[PDB]
């Protein structure tokens, strides 16, 4: 055996060019260059936290690549996978529409070279005279184009490669951010292709150097940019079951699908084609012919539905499904979950993130711990609570700090200290039964308060029932009691219900919040304790998964209810318990993914926009980096438990005021059917909280002191 032996042995990236049905290694210093007339095979191996190796097999098809060449690359992807015991995730990437995972492997971006093995061009390779058109802001792509002014336009940047002189040219209508990412490609040509020997010359229209003007002739009038992502065709997806010939059978009309719909004896197609990707899921018991023919059937299904030929397709084995595939299902939970160190798959873009458990004594020094637990600090800073009464904020009685009523909406101005510096957080808590005028009034006043405090404070819109972990910790040691629906104003206190049911649950911080729920048995949960104040006896129901903090919260919540507790463990409930709840019922028993939520729902950064009301979101691939936050964009950092809205200083005011709704739109369209009470957190550039910056390793506190572009072209360019 040849190159197969030197494969997934160590963590890293391996690229081969399929050359005459042979896997020829691409020189590593050229990783990122791809000939449009050829096909490549790419293996990314990632080390899991337990030391095991996880494989991602990609094969890449250029625009001018033959059919017998894509087949060759496909055969290798198949036979490489079963050499790795059929546990790899396979990807078919087409030029210009590659998967985010594939795009993450390449920092400096991609280069699409004219030529191929048929044209008689190798990779190894002096005298150079080529031209690249650099289009891209988050996925910088450099396409080789004819060496002519006709190839140009004033919207993008261009690189005139003259061997020992690289000439970067940028149009007048080109944005400063695009110019920045273009210098990366130019620098990459200098350092990787010429080994740092050549000189990179930067210019814009009107300042063309004589060398460039000698090659292209005098500059004529140039046009403008064609300006190229995900829209609202994200929500709907369908699941199919394959037979062989090739026929499919609809098994699930709408997502979220039932995880049990996947049977291990067959293979299934998750159709997300209107969003540009489809999945193939191999059951472990599926026929060997069926498994090896996954890409076979996937391409057929593409044509039988009239999807674009360039549709992303990925192939998953049972047990190694990616988290996006799992999110298409209603509460996907694995047959290991709690036991182990990870899950089905570890997203490469967070594979190098050190996992920091919680310890409040040193929260104030670790941005990473702050981000991984949604904990800006310990919750012990100065704060003000206001209840919204009509059109004004009313100070809440300090004795009742920690109790919130479902018929009110509150504003919580909190002072946080982390590291050496401070910040402020404005929490906007809107009750479920709060009247619409006052809920809307709470939002108006929340924004007004932010401007009073200089526009610097963080804004967080919370909805009753789904409160961030940090919010629970603001009240010292007492729990955050949330009532189903009453008022706290002076002439309006309602009457307590006959029998009430409280779900007391703790965060990673040990703070707890008892949530008053419906008085039904189906509302119970094995991981938390519960409090049932019936007029007869007050029950303290403690689940098998409940710990000290939940008992302490449930106990001390029964304190404020002036009722003696009746300790009752799960499974051994007295008679009166079930009948007070309306009888026995099926509740949730499966444990939660406490520290493995990151593995299940890794944080993703997005760029949101709405040009003509059309909501456009584009995922930025790879490791989360401060460099990826453009000053003229409104970005989205989705941590599952929360959706941050990073607002760039130089973005348009329209997009700035729409920060709340753009996030609300992204959550609404999420194919995972994400809860709409999910807290949204608006954050200003240069005033980001620790729970945000801790996700970005290598965060320069004074990164924006010098303009990013003014630094790059002054650095090594």
UniProtKB/Swiss-Prot annotation:
Gene3D superfamilies: Severin (3.40.20.10)
Residue sites binding Ca(2+) 7 per the record: 527-528, 550
Segments of skewed composition (Basic and acidic residues): 189-204
Annotated consequence of substituting residue 633 to N: Does not result in actin depolymerization activity in absence of calcium. Has actin depolymerization activity in absence of calcium
Chain residues that bind Ca(2+) 8: 632-633, 655
Annotated positions binding Ca(2+) 5: 407-408, 438, 487
Binding-site list for Ca(2+) 1: 37-38, 69, 117
Protein name per its UniProtKB record: Gelsolin
Organism from which the protein derives: Homo sapiens (Human)
Taxonomic classification: Eukaryota, Metazoa, Chordata, Craniata, Vertebrata
Recorded name of the encoding gene: GSN
């Amino acid at each position: 055996h040849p190159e197969f032996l030197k494969a997934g042995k160590e963590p890293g990236l391996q690229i081969w060019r399929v050359e005459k049905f042979d896997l020829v290694p691409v020189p590593t210093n050229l990783y990122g260059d791809f000939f449009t007339g050829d096909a490549y095979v790419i293996l990314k191996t990632v080390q899991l936290r337990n030391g095991n190796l996880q494989y991602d097999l990609h094969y890449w098809l250029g625009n001018e690549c033959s059919q017998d060449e894509s087949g060759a690359a496909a055969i290798f992807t198949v036979q490489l996978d079963d050499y790795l015991n059929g546990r790899a995730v396979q990807h078919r990437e087409v030029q210009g529409f590659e998967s985010a995972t594939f795009l993450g492997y390449f920092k400096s971006g991609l280069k699409y070279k004219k030529g191929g093995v048929a044209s008689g061009f190798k990779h190894v390779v002096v005298v150079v005279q080529r031209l690249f058109q650099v289009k891209g802001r988050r996925v910088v792509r450099a396409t080789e184009v004819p060496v002519s002014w006709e190839s140009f336009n004033n919207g993008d940047c261009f690189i005139l490669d003259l061997g020992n002189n690289i000439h970067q040219w940028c149009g007048s209508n080109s944005n400063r951010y695009e110019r920045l990412k273009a210098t990366q490609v130019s620098k990459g040509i200098r350092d990787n292709e010429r080994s740092g020997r050549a000189r990179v010359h930067v210019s814009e229209e009107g300042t063309e150097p004589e060398a460039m003007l000698q090659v292209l002739g005098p500059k004529p009038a140039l046009p403008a940019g064609t300006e190229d992502e995900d829209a609202a065709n994200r929500k709907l997806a369908k699941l199919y079951k394959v037979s062989n010939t090739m026929s499919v059978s609809l098994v699930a009309d709408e997502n979220p699908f039932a995880q049990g719909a996947l049977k291990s004896e067959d293979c299934f197609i998750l159709d997300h084609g209107k969003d540009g990707k489809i999945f193939v899921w191999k059951g472990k018991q599926a026929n060997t012919e069926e498994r090896k023919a996954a890409l076979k059937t996937a391409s057929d299904f593409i044509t039988k539905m009239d999807y674009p030929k360039q549709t992303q397709v990925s192939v998953l084995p049972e047990g190694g499904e990616t988290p996006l595939f799992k999110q298409f299902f209603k509460n996907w939970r694995d047959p290991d979950q709690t036991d182990g160190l990870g899950l089905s798959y570890l997203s490469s873009h967070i594979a190098n993130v050190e996992r920091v458990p919680f310890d409040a004594a040193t929260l104030h020094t670790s941005t990473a711990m702050a981000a991984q637990h949604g904990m800006d600090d310990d919750g012990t800073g100065q704060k003000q609570i206001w209840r919204i009464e009509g059109s004004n904020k009313v100070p809440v009685d300090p004795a009742t700090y920690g109790q919130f009523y479902g018929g009110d909406s509150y504003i919580i101005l909190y002072n946080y200290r982390h590291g050496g510096r401070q910040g402020q957080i404005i929490y906007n808590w809107q009750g479920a039964q709060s009247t619409q005028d006052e809920v809307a009034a709470s939002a108006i006043l929340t924004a007004q308060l932010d401007e009073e405090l200089g526009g610097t404070p963080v804004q967080s819109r919370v909805v009753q029932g789904k409160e961030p972990a940090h919010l629970m910790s603001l009240f010292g040691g007492k729990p955050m009691i949330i009532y189903k629906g009453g008022t706290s104003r002076e002439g309006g206190q309602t009457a307590p219900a006959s029998t009430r049911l409280f779900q007391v649950r703790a965060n990673s911080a040990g703070a707890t919040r008892p949530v008053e729920v419906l008085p039904k048995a189906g509302a119970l949960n094995s991981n938390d304790a519960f409090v049932l104040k019936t007029p007869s006896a007050a029950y303290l129901w403690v689940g098998t998964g409940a710990s000290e903090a939940e008992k302490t919260g449930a106990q001390e919540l029964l304190r404020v209810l002036r009722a003696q507790p009746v300790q009752v463990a799960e499974g051994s409930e007295p008679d009166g318990f079930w009948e007070a709840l309306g009888g026995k019922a099926a509740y949730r028993t499966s444990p939660r993914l406490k520290d493995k939520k990151m593995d299940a729902h890794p944080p993703r950064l997005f760029a949101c926009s709405n040009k003509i009301g059309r909501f456009v979101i584009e995922e930025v691939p790879g490791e989360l980096m401060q460099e990826d936050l453009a000053t003229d964009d409104v970005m989205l950092l989705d941590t599952w438990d929360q959706v941050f809205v990073w607002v760039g200083k130089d973005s348009q005011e329209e997009e700035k005021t729409e920060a709340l709704t753009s996030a609300k739109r992204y959550i609404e369209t999420d194919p995972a059917n994400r809860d709409r009470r999910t807290p949204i957190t608006v954050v200003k550039q240069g005033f980001e909280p620790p729970s945000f910056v801790g996700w970005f390793l290598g965060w320069d506190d004074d990164y924006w002191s010098v303009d990013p572009l003014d630094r790059a072209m002054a650095e090594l360019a």
